[PDB]
Amino acid sequence: NKITAGGLEFLVRFAAPTDRLKINDLMIDTARWLKESGSTQWSDILHGFDVHNIEQRIELGEVALFETEAGALAGAMIIRKTPSDWDTDLWEDLAIDKAYYLHRIMVSRAFSGISLSKQMIYFAEKLGIEMSVPFIRLDCIESNETLNQMYVRYGFQFSGKKNGFYLYQKELSQK
């Protein structure tokens, strides 16, 4: 599992193969919405949404789904449990550390503005702790002020810059 956001309860589970078509609809709808919102960042044009490899994301346990009790999909999160080729290039000699890389947060507009993303990332933190992984990592386009502010507010440490991105990591305590 349970997470709470905005005083509301959600259930978290890893995606299964039968979730594919719904995730695929969610990524299509999120891409359309980003375009229409006029908030077009070159980083979204670079990264896209992982429609082409969704089956392997599901197989590897890299998709987390956040649902209401009635079964509405409130959010989905894409991670990488090992660095992608981009993560490895971006992070340079830090790429050899074990870390999870958060690639995409998707939140339903019905559930936007309750900081559901904070709890989605917290779930990744908990997973990394369970698995003895020392860091959660992500990158952010240098020009998105509000998103950069958000990551800092959520406790990520600024760790450098490359290719027009700022790099952030959160150390995960085994204490």
Residue 32, domain CATH:
3.40.630.30
Which residue is it, tokens 């450098």? Answer: 160
Reading the block at residue 126, the tokens are 């908990």
CA atoms within 13 A on the CB side of 32: 6
Tell me the one-letter amino acid at 93. Answer: D
Structure tokens at 101: 């890389």
Among all chains, which residue has been given the structure tokens 């590897």? 60
Structure solved via: X-ray
**Token duo for residue 33:** 């919405």
Domain total for the chain?
1
Give 53-56's long-range contacts (Cβ < 8 A, gap of 24+): 54/20, 54/23, 54/24, 54/27, 55/17, 55/20
What's this structure's resolution in Å?
1.5
Burial class (CB in 10 A: 0-12, 13-18, 19+), 134: middle
Amino acid at 129: I
Contact 123, 116 (CB under 8 A): no
Exposure of 39 by Cβ count < 10 A (0-12 exposed, 13-18 middle, 19+ buried)?
exposed
Q: Which range marks the domain in which residue 148 is found?
A: 1-175
**DSSP state, residue 49:** -
Please state, as a whole number, how many other Cβ atoms lie within 10 Å of the Cβ of residue 140: 20
Diameter of the chain measured on Cα atoms: 45
